[PDB]
Amino acid sequence: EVQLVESGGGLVQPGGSLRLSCAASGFTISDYWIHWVRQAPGKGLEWVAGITPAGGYTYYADSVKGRFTISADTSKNTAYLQMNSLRAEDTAVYYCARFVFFLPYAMDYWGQGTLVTVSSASTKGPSVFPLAPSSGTAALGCLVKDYFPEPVTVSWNSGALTSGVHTFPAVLQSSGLYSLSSVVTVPSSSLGTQTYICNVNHKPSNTKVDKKVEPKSC
């Protein structure tokens, strides 16, 4: 049961510090290189750092050299990226991946990623407002406004409704806070005869709102 499990991502201030960990199961980390590879929102895959088998040597990208340290604790079978003097542009999802120059000399096993967001903004949970159906078949939803940082989860009728649901990619407002909306189309005959609750989660702020979406006054 070979796997790479990471943790440690989150919000830090510019100039702050974070340590990401990468736990190996069912193989010995020290038999492989571990590479950290990062993916800035929307961008490609940028290699960041690599540590050699047995901890023989260590390499860093120039954008990161002198700020980040890669190592591992073998008794813990876990690799680490220690991130110091973080800047805005370090915001990315961070992956660890194993590698060796023996076949297949490619990155066969990867961690799932953690979000590192580097910002001077505080954590903030969203406000959740209903999108009340106007006026066949009609639409309603939830506006999830003003939160930080990512991510946010949305689900409908506590997961008993999925078909026709579109939760939109968050958009970074010029206030610095994220906003998104989750939306669903329903039969206009089953509205006002069935209750619709959207279930918004914002783990970073420990915010969980459930919202009853119903028609308007006039």
Partner: protein, 211 residues
């Protein structure tokens, strides 16, 4: 540092299509090139290693070719679940470098968007800000033009759009346009119109309401 350039950056194709992606290295890298597949919110999956070899458990319809500077990934018969972003990667020297990625999109017939306009909630208004939302549901292609008319006036740099990933069942997109103003500025205006231009539409569709 060895540079890897993929071609093209994006493409549209239908199920059953033969699709080929190319990768060009800034210098000779033997056959030490790998191909990865990535789906939103998931880590990359190794597909091909050593330029042309199929990674264990990957289905026979994925294949690779090339050596030196020019490399190629082929998908002989495109399957539904094959829409992703594909990356080549050079493994010949430290550090390993990736191509920029090739987003494989699924080509289908033009479908018109159902438009919906949502007023600000009586709950939101009590905070001094007003969000008006315009929805474009289940359409193709991605390209669209959403216009905000407010008392017959065009708007500039005060609305924001978001677009859904390609749908599971019908491969359509969906789009939200969100207009944001102040309460005192929302209160002093009447007609709120969202004008939609799209290829699947015979004539630009306006969805409005009365304050």
């Amino acid at each position: 540092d060895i540079q890897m350039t993929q071609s093209p950056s994006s493409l549209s194709a239908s199920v059953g299509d033969r699709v080929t992606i190319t990768c060009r290295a800034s210098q000779d890298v033997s056959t030490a090139v790998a191909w990865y597949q990535q789906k939103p919110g998931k880590a990359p999956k190794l597909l091909i290693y050593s330029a042309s070899f199929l990674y264990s458990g990957v289905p026979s319809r994925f294949s690779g070719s090339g050596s030196g500077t020019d490399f190629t990934l082929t998908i002989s018969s495109l399957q539904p679940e094959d829409f992703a972003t594909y990356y080549c990667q050079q493994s010949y020297t430290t550090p390993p470098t990736f191509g920029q990625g090739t987003k494989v999109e699924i080509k289908r017939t033009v479908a018109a968007p159902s438009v919906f306009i949502f007023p600000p909630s009586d709950e939101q208004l009590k905070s001094g800000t007003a969000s008006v939302v315009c929805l474009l549901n289940n359409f193709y292609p991605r390209e669209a033009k959403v216009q905000w008319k407010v008392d017959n006036a065009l708007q500039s740099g005060n609305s924001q759009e978001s677009v859904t990933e390609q749908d599971s069942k019908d491969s359509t997109y969906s789009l939200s346009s969100t207009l944001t103003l102040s309460k005192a500025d929302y209160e002093k205006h009447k007609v709120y119109a969202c004008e939609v231009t799209h290829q699947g539409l015979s004539s630009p569709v306006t969805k409005s309401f009365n304050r």
